[PDB]
Design a binder for this molecule. Structure first.
Ligand SMILES: Nc1ncnc2c1ncn2[C@@H]1O[C@H](COP(=O)(O)OP(=O)(O)OP(=O)(O)O)[C@@H](O)[C@H]1O
Ligand SMILES: Nc1ncnc2c1ncn2[C@@H]1O[C@H](COP(=O)(O)OP(=O)(O)OP(=O)(O)O)[C@@H](O)[C@H]1O
Ligand SMILES: Nc1ncnc2c1ncn2[C@@H]1O[C@H](COP(=O)(O)OP(=O)(O)O)[C@@H](O)[C@H]1O
Ligand SMILES: Nc1ncnc2c1ncn2[C@@H]1O[C@H](COP(=O)(O)OP(=O)(O)O)[C@@H](O)[C@H]1O
Ligand SMILES: [Mg+2]
Ligand SMILES: [Mg+2]
Ligand SMILES: [Mg+2]
Lengths: 232, 238, 397, 239, 248, 391, 140
């Protein structure tokens, strides 16, 4: 980074549909890193006592600095840093104060060093523009719902401990999941296991996976055909 | 709580005021300063150009126009509003020169134009007309059977014979100065000199040939707008 | 009063290519650093100076005892007794001992008190609670006006507000105008507000006090206004000084009728800040600089012309400012000759200074992706949309 | 408040809907037109078609009559509607008076149409500004700008749309009497003004030239590369 | 705010009602058409076939207008029917007046003018329908135009509109070789695009609505792919996908 | 394309090959530079903080021990209700700041006549007996008070308030300088007036000007001052201010930004103390009250009752003649040319408050300094009013 | 239809550590106390044995997240977000099963209705024929 002449990246945001690997990726990063990982998952910085949230932000960043190159994982950053509300009265301000303190710590007058920070959310569009700003959050990584090969890979991961039968074709099961998040794939594995458990067996068959897919992915559609036929 | 009466012209304030009409009146101050003065020898109309860019064609910006060879005009307000007003005035003057085959007096000119005005709240707008008060103050000057005559028109439709009236952004100050600078026996040349003096004291920039449009109407000649050389002649003295 | 602070080392960056000119310059710097170290080491190696008064000092210390609790002299009475409030907040009518400098006692100065039978036994002019001490800049930031691209009008205004009065101010009273007490920076995020604050703090000759705005708020009742008062007292005490309150909207929001005690205390902290900003004369050499993104949400009494006259606007950078910023942030890069950089600047976007810096960093990362460091134009081309995430086509065409 | 009503004066005397429609032009695209001694030129920034758009039907520059042309900035549907109405009116004017429509007449008609569309509720103003160009019967070069407020004005060389202020200042600093001595000089000025905002050059620019009743042919994309070769040549020539 | 009747202007200049009429097409069924060397076709999605629709129709998303004019619809059903009827009326009025089939560009501009007039004035909600007209004319041979509820239009050689339209058109432009597709390759490309854009592992021919326009023997023939034909095409593309994956 | 993570060999080759031959010594030297800075910082020392030690021979250390062993400290408290003492209940509830409250009896050295409610009193530790009353004292150096006996602003320095200043003349000049007319007209002089108007209109300044020209000393009472730290005893503080106004031949008591006070426990104690010092104090006095707020209605309804506040005065934004007059009055103190069309500037800044006009003049000076010219031109004023006005 | 009763029966027929809370109980007066109480209940469940957390009427706090424009709505959504991050956050829970009952499932946040947080969304319809017979028999 010094030889290239570029500035070191600081933050990174993991945004996407609910349940894709965001918190899982943060957990893995914590597992595979020599940095002093920090979990400061959101709404832990919201204290009843006035001005305590900003103080806790400062203490958290000073502790991260005092230690080695560290990683701060602000899970569900949708909570504290969302969007500054005009005025007071009914609008929140203390949380805005905490968020502004976080913003200044991230990229302000002091210019912290080796404090790489990860944040996650399902609603990036509502995050404050001053928080999404590059230099404070670069590489806004998107976690889209897995495609068919990715769904197959997730299935092969989460059925690893299972007692599969000869003749199981996980590719068909992955195909049976159009636009299914990874958490839903793990849930399908679990529900197929439960279908095996109900019959007091230990093997899972293809029909078990098909019924688990049907059960997990089951969702309420538009019952009224006439409403559904408004659009061509 | 005024807010319930500014919305729409057909509302009456608790003080019985027409807030939409008052807003239209104040919208005149958005326009450039126009000064007209009435003298026994005639009337002269002085205006500010307020040129936005040197690349502008000065002929396009029209602050003074001709309704008929015997009468003159000055504008302050919306360009399109005054365009419709002036077109209607010219159509009316030809209507009179058709019906009576005579030159129609400036008081009747402002009468007809004010008839087109003050028609915003009139049910005859069903074919299509102003749903909003006209937003330009008019300065009418010319010579008729009563000699030289200058009339000032109010977007509300009111008109008054004025010896010297100033409309536009600096209407208050220019009127205050004209109050003491005007005399009844003022000659045309000294009146126009005084008018450019007031413009110099009032206008935001220096007076050059492209800052002022000048007009004159006398019983002898017809409506004459001062050319570049005439403007230079009248401005070199001042 | 004493003088300003914020000592910084040398700009260097006279070269930046490591052509050994950097090496002679840093060698001179390090050699002189060694000289300072050797001098002070050898000074403390031989520095015998102690005792002298001793017994008089010994007995005045014995009168002082141990520990001696510091207190804030709230009020003075006839010159043997005074009113002093302990840091708890309880205040007592105590006696002032003979050996205290009666000239130094002034309402607000920290006074040493006897632990038992409270009595004024000394005066501390350097209390400076750790919070306000931290809020003071010691090592000036490395950024400089050369690092800022564009913002010529902004730099010019900020220098007229917080440099020209500290340097030769004769023009100001020559023209009869008061110097502008306080300036406020505003604009969209990442446009150069905090960067301009760093640059000012670099080429400065006054105490620079960086403040987060939200830092002023404190949990305990009365700690907020007390902190603001102490911060500005330090600013006057170390005059000339510059007080930079970043993110002023953390407290500068619209004032409204407070109900909860915390909201009341926030309102009180802002009232104390505003009263303090009124307190020092504009002729005084303490200037405040506040930055915010949501300018519209500020209290229209904090931005009164009698309080904060100047208002520096930070618009999103134009094409020429974009190219200046790109020149600045690609200066260290080993750009290949094929890169034009004008395609990105052309693209009608809301690229900020921060966005340009991130585009450059991502381009460097993408070059590293291909094992190279020469950074072609293709790397910038992909980096632009890599960083710039997120009118329906033919509406306005 | 006072903004969501086309025919309601604000307390400070503004028809805010009209000014908002006017501002809607600034979100269009740059269109600059210059009138020369014998030529009038129209330089417009062309949206680079991604992969599939047919450029034949993305017409930004259109001619109202054989003696007048116009470029627009604003919503394309409004521009198409005003183009149809104004060319219909040119034909009807030739029906009534048998002589070619002067630029003043057609510009006045366009301004009056826009105005009658911005003086009553239930009628949204035409949020487009059009640069009217053409020669009169005596072949005098005249250029007019029409504003969504319903007004018109005579401009020697004007620019509209996004970045129109920069092009305006460029023309102020570069418009000279000798800069219009020859057709090539006027072309050089107009391409220079265009590349001021659209610096990519090559494509993304369309040009049209009207000489003394040639029934203008838009410069075809063979000599735009030739003309930009000339522009780059003169550009490396003075530097 | 400025979300009232369409005859309003946001301070930034945006026409919010027109904007919502734009984004509303994202709720409509996905339909596309592409321009081949010697042919043009329209592919559409039958989003609503639950179990018991009689299918007493010639085409739902695709509506024929004239011996030479055909279009696909995407929007509210009522505005869809109104737009189709007005298209027929205008095309045949032009035919009666001029004794020539209406040029595609002229009819497209007529529709666009009507749609603009429905958002220009009157306090009437704009037609929330985006059209894909397909047709032939002697002036430019085979042409395809993509309408717009805003009242705009564009000539395109590849365009998808409906749900998941952005990804479909992105991959379509990724995989378009202009000037070198016949009808067969165009059909294969459309089927692949439908595969990628629909929410189905194996799209059924029932959910697919394809009509092809081709000029031959001096006359232009508009035909919708029959069930046998569409099933043959989808099975051919299916074994082609199988070939691609087994080779992979 | 699957992008490969840089291998250890790849890291090693990136660290070299494409490096300047001086990377090593440059980086090492800069590291030692920072290390030496840290060493100097850590070992430079702090230096003795210089506690407040008086010069020698000034110390009475023997008597210091005498006091430290004999004289005792006293806690101070906010005394409250007298419990209706009558010499059989000498106890009073006293409030020792954030500590508790206690009922306590007097010391023998003090008499009950010297003790009343609301005052600061020094109380001992052992029995909490009030040992000495401690008046909060009055001093212009402390608080923020009148700090003015003859303000430097006359009627000349105020412009654009002609009807405003004329009504103020009616209010203050006629009773103070012509008492006989209301004596023989048998009418009580106006008892209170409220100068309500938008901020920056000139309320404070007009009040100060009329104070200078009424031959009475101007009183400045900032509301946030006694809302903040100087709260509580503020009742006795204004009590003393009013008492000194009694001793003073004539005071012009104006409470600055009374929006901060009129809008309440000690606040209510205060304005009831003014109930005692306007209602209780005779309405005939020469210490007339002046009320000025940004929020008119904020004042408590019991204040403007007839017989407490006779008049209410509206300070509106200056007019065209007013704006040019304030422009002249502000540019007199400035280096400008003698042909500045102030009427033009006043026209160019409609509905502009006076503070905006003073800031416009200041910005015109700034623009003049920008070009390093000793005299500001009309062009500078034009661009300044383009800057400040129009925001 | 039997939701709270099934929770009651589970609480009776369990060796687990049962923690009963209602949704409206979470929403506290003071700012930041609701999320703190969510943290505390889950922490108590974690530090105890295999535990069950029952949150009746979860639609009080787990309504679909939207662009809150007030402090109160932001606080309610903060409570929901703390619930989410506690259920399936960075530091997982072991042997802490959470039962949540609501009358309007469709108004619940989709992030709360995904496997890994609410693995099973069990429908409790109105009794059908045989269910009516069973209920009548067990009540009479
Ligand atoms: N790509 C994936 N590969 C393997 N397992 C996955 C993947 N995505 C999700 N999972 C599994 O599904 C669950 C998803 O939970 P996780 O917290 O990681 O999701 P998320 O995207 O962070 O959700 P949330 O928006 O609630 O934070 C985990 O239990 C994880 O094991
Ligand atoms: N004009 C500029 N020239 C060079 N770099 C710039 C410029 N403007 C911004 N930058 C870059 O942007 C980065 C971040 O900007 P900065 O910290 O000043 O943000 P800001 O505008 O004060 O925003 P905020 O206070 O809302 O976070 C700086 O580190 C700097 O490199
Ligand atoms: N009528 C006026 N004449 C002269 N100066 C005025 C006038 N009105 C306002 N000002 C200027 O406004 C500035 C501040 O006015 P101030 O009295 O603080 O306003 P407020 O009435 O809100 O207290 C003063 O410096 C003064 O010069
Ligand atoms: N299956 C059942 N068997 C017997 N009683 C039932 C059954 N379902 C509901 N009830 C009756 O209805 C009540 C159950 O209320 P419940 O369904 O828990 O409310 P909610 O659905 O709001 O949680 C009980 O008091 C019980 O008497
Ligand atoms: Mg998570
Ligand atoms: Mg910043
Ligand atoms: Mg229940």
């Amino acid at each position: 980074f010094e030889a290239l002449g570029i500035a070191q990246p600081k933050g990174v945001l993991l945004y996407g549909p609910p349940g894709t690997g965001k918190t899982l990726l943060a957990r893995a990063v914590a597992h595979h890193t020599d940095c002093t990982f920090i979990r400061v998952s959101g709404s832990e910085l919201v204290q009843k006592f006035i001005g305590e949230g900003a103080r806790m932000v400062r203490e958290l960043f000073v502790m991260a600095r005092e230690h080695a190159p560290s990683i701060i994982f602000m899970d569900e950053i949708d909570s504290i840093g969302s969007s500054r509300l005009e005025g007071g009265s009914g609008g929140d301000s203390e949380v805005q104060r905490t968020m502004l303190e976080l913003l200044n710590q991230l990229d302000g007058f002091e210019a912290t060093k080796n404090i790489k920070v990860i944040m996650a959310t399902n609603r990036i569009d509502i995050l404050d523009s001053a928080l999404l700003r590059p230099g404070r959050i670069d590489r806004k990584i998107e976690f889209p719902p897995p495609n068919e090969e990715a769904r197959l890979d997730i299935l092969k991961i989460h059925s690893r401990k299972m007692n599969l039968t000869r003749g199981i074709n996980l590719r068909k099961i992955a195909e049976l999941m159009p636009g299914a998040s990874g958490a839903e794939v793990k849930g399908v594995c679990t529900e197929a296991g439960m279908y095996a458990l109900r019959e007091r067996r230990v093997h899972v068959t293809q029909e078990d996976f098909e019924m688990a897919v049907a059960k997990v992915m089951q969702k309420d559609s538009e019952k009224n055909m006439s409403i559904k036929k408004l659009w061509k | 709580t005024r807010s319930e009466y500014d919305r729409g012209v057909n509302t009456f304030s608790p003080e019985g005021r027409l807030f939409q009409v008052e807003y239209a009146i104040e919208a005149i101050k958005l326009g450039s300063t126009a000064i007209g003065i009435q003298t026994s020898e005639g009337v002269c109309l002085a205006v500010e150009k307020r040129i936005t860019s040197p690349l502008m064609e000065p002929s396009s910006i029209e602050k003074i126009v001709e309704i008929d060879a015997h009468i003159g005009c000055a504008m302050s307000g919306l360009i399109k509003d005054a365009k419709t007003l002036i077109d209607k005035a010219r159509v009316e003057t030809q209507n009179h020169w058709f019906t009576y085959n005579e030159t129609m007096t400036v008081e009747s000119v402002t009468q007809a134009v004010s008839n087109l005005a003050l028609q915003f709240g009139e049910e005859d707008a069903d074919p299509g007309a102003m749903s909003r008060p006209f937003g330009v103050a008019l300065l009418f000057g010319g010579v008729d059977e009563k000699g030289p005559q200058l009339f000032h028109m109010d977007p509300s439709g009111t008109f008054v014979q004025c010896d010297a009236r100033a409309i536009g952004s600096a209407s208050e100050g220019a009127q205050s100065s004209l109050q003491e600078v005007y005399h009844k026996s003022m000659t045309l040349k000294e009146a126009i000199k005084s008018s450019l003096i007031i413009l110099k004291q009032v206008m935001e920039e220096k007076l050059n040939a492209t800052n002022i449009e000048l007009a004159t109407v006398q019983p002898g000649q017809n409506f004459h707008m001062f050319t570049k050389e005439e403007l230079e002649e009248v401005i070199k003295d001042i | 009063t004493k003088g300003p602070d914020a000592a910084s080392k040398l700009p260097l960056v006279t070269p930046h290519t490591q052509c050994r000119l950097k090496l002679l310059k840093l060698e001179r710097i390090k050699d002189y650093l060694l000289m300072e170290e050797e001098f002070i080491r050898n000074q403390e190696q031989m520095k015998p100076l102690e005792e002298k008064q001793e017994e008089e000092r010994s007995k005045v210390d014995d009168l002082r005892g141990t520990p001696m609790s510091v207190g804030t002299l709230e009020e003075i009475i006839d010159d043997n007794h005074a009113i002093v409030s302990t840091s708890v907040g309880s205040e007592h009518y105590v006696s002032i001992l003979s050996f205290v400098d009666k000239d130094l006692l002034e309402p607000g100065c920290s006074v040493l008190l006897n632990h038992k039978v409270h009595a004024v036994i000394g005066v501390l002019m350097d209390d400076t609670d750790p919070l306000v001490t931290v809020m003071k800049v010691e090592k000036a930031p490395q950024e400089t006006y050369a690092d800022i691209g564009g913002l010529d009008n902004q730099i010019q205004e900020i220098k007229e507000s917080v440099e020209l009065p500290l340097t030769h101010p004769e023009y100001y009273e020559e023209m009869g105008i008061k110097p502008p007490k306080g300036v406020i920076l505003y604009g969209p995020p990442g446009t150069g507000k905090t960067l301009l604050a760093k640059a000012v703090a670099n080429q400065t000759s006054a105490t620079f006090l960086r403040v987060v705005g939200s830092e002023l708020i404190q949990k305990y009742l009365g700690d907020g206004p007390k902190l603001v008062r102490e911060l500005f007292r330090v600013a006057e005490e170390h005059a000339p000084s510059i007080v930079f309150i970043d993110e002023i909207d953390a407290i500068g929001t619209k004032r409204y009728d407070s109900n909860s005690g915390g909201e009341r205390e926030i309102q009180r902290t802002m009232l104390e800040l505003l009263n303090q900003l009124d307190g020092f004369d504009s002729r005084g050499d303490v200037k405040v600089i506040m930055a915010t993104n949501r300018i519209e949400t500020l209290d229209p009494a904090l931005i009164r012309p009698g309080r904060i006259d100047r208002k520096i606007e930070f618009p999103l950078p134009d094409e020429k400012t974009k190219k200046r910023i790109f020149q600045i942030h690609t200066s260290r890069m080993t750009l290949a000759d094929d890169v034009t950089l004008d395609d990105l600047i052309m693209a009608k976007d809301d690229l900020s200074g921060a966005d340009i810096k991130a585009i450059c960093t991502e381009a460097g990362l993408m070059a590293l992706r291909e094992r190279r460091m020469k950074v072609t134009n293709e790397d910038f081309k992909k980096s632009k949309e890599n960083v710039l995430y997120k009118t329906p086509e033919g509406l306005y065409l | 408040s006072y903004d969501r009503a086309i025919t309601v004066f604000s307390p400070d005397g503004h028809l805010f809907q009209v000014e908002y429609a006017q501002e809607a032009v600034k979100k269009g695209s740059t269109a600059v037109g210059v009138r020369g001694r014998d030529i009038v030129v129209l330089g417009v920034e062309k949206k680079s078609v991604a992969k599939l758009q047919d450029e034949r039907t993305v017409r930004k520059i259109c001619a109202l009559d054989d003696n007048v042309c116009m470029a627009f900035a604003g919503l394309t549907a409004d521009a198409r509607i005003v183009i149809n109405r104004a060319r219909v009116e040119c034909q009807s004017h030739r029906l009534t008076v048998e002589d070619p429509v002067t630029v003043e007449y057609i510009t006045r008609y366009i301004a009056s149409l826009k105005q009658r569309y911005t003086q009553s509720n239930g009628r949204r103003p035409f949020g487009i500004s059009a640069l009217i160009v053409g020669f009169d019967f005596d072949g005098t070069p005249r250029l007019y700008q029409t504003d969504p407020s319903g007004t018109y004005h005579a401009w020697k060389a004007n620019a509209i749309g996004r970045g129109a202020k920069s092009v305006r200042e460029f023309l102020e600093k570069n418009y000279t009497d000798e800069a219009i001595e020859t057709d090539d000089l006027t072309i050089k000025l107009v391409i220079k003004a265009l590349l001021e905002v659209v610096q990519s050059g090559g494509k993304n620019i369309e040009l049209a030239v009207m000489r003394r009743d040639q029934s203008l042919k838009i410069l075809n994309p063979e000599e735009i590369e030739k003309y930009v070769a000339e522009i780059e040549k003169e550009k490396e020539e003075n530097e | 705010r400025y979300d009232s009747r369409t005859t309003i202007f946001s301070p930034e200049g945006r026409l919010y009602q027109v904007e919502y009429a734009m984004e509303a097409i994202g709720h409509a069924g996905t339909c596309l058409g592409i321009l081949a060397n010697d042919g043009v076709l329209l592919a559409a999605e039958r989003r609503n076939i639950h179990k018991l629709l009689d299918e007493v129709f010639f085409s739902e998303k695709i509506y024929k207008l004239n011996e030479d004019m055909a279009c696909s619809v995407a929007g509210i059903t009522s505005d869809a029917n109104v737009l189709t009827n007005e298209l027929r009326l205008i095309a045949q009025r032009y035919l009666l007046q001029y004794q020539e089939p209406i040029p595609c560009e002229q009819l497209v501009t007529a529709l666009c003018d009507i749609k603009q007039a429905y958002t220009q004035f009157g306090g009437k909600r704009p037609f929330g329908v985006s059209l894909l007209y397909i047709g032939w004319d002697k002036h430019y041979g085979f042409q395809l135009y993509q309408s717009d509820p805003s009242g705009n239009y564009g000539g395109w050689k590849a365009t998808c509109i409906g749900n998941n339209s952005a990804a479909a058109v992105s991959m379509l432009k990724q995989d378009y070789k202009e000037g070198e597709m016949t009808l067969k390759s165009a059909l294969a490309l459309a089927i692949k695009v439908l595969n990628k854009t629909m929410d189905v592992s194996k799209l059924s021919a029932e959910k697919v609505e394809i009509a092809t326009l081709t000029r031959e023997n001096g006359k232009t023939v508009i035909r919708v792919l029959k069930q046998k034909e569409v099933e043959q095409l989808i099975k051919k593309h299916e074994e082609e996908e199988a070939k691609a994956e087994r080779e992979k | 394309k699957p992008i490969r993570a840089l291998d250890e060999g790849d890291i090693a080759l990136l660290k070299t090959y494409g490096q300047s031959t001086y990377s090593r010594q440059i980086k090492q030297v800069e590291d030692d530079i920072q290390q030496l800075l840290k060493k100097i910082n850590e070992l430079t020392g702090i230096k003795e903080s210089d506690t407040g030690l008086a010069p020698p021979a000034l110390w009475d250390l023997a008597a210091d021990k005498q006091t430290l062993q004999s004289e005792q400290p006293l806690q101070v408290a906010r005394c409250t209700k007298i419990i209706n003492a009558d010499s059989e209940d000498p106890k009073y509830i006293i409030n020792v700041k954030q500590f508790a409250k206690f009922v306590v009896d007097l010391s023998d050295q003090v008499a009950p006549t010297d003790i009343e409610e609301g005052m600061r009193v020094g109380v001992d530790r052992n029995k909490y007996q009030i040992h000495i009353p401690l008046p909060p004292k009055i001093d212009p150096t402390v608080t923020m008070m009148q700090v003015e006996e003859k303000p430097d602003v006359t009627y000349s320095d105020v412009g654009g308030c002609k009807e405003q200043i004329e009504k103020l003349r009616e209010v203050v000049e006629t009773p103070l300088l012509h008492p006989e007319r209301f004596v023989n007209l048998g009418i009580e002089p106006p008892k209170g007036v409220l100068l309500f108007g938008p901020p920056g209109t000139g309320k404070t300044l007009c009040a100060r000007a009329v104070a200078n020209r009424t031959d009475a000393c101007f009183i400045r009472v900032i509301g946030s001052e006694l809302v903040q730290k100087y709260v509580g005893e503020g009742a006795r503080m204004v009590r003393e201010l009013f008492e000194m106004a009694r001793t003073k031949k004539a005071c012009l008591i104006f409470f600055d930004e009374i929006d901060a006070i009129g809008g309440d426990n000690e606040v209510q104690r205060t304005m009831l103390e003014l109930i005692n010092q306007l209602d209780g104090f005779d309405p005939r006095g020469n210490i007339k009250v002046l009320m000025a707020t940004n929020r008119p209605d904020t004042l408590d309804p019991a204040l403007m009752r007839p017989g407490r506040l006779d008049r209410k005065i509206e300070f509106s934004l200056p007019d065209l003649e007013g704006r040019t007059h304030i422009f002249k009055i502000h540019a007199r103190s400035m280096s400008v040319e003698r042909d500045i069309r102030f009427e033009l500037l006043a026209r160019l800044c409609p509905n502009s408050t006076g503070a905006e006009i003073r800031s416009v003049c200041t910005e015109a000076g700034m623009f003049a300094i920008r070009a390093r010219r000793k005299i500001a031109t009309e062009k500078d004023f034009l661009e300044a009013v383009n800057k400040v006005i129009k925001s | 239809c039997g939701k709270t009763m099934l929770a009651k029966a589970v609480a009776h027929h369990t060796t687990a550590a049962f923690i009963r809370v209602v949704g409206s109980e979470f929403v506290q007066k003071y700012l930041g106390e609701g999320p703190r109480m969510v943290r505390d209940v889950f922490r108590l469940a974690k530090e105890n044995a295999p535990a069950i957390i029952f949150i009746d009427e979860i639609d009080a706090i787990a309504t679909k997240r939207f662009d809150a424009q007030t402090g109160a709505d932001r606080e309610v959504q903060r409570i929901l977000l703390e619930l989410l991050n506690q259920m399936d956050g960075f530091d997982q829970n072991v042997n802490v099963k959470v039962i949540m009952a609501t009358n309007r499932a469709d108004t619940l946040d989709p992030a709360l209705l995904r496997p890994g947080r609410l693995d099973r969304k069990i429908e409790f319809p109105l009794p059908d024929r045989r269910q009516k017979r069973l209920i009548f028999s067990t009540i009479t």
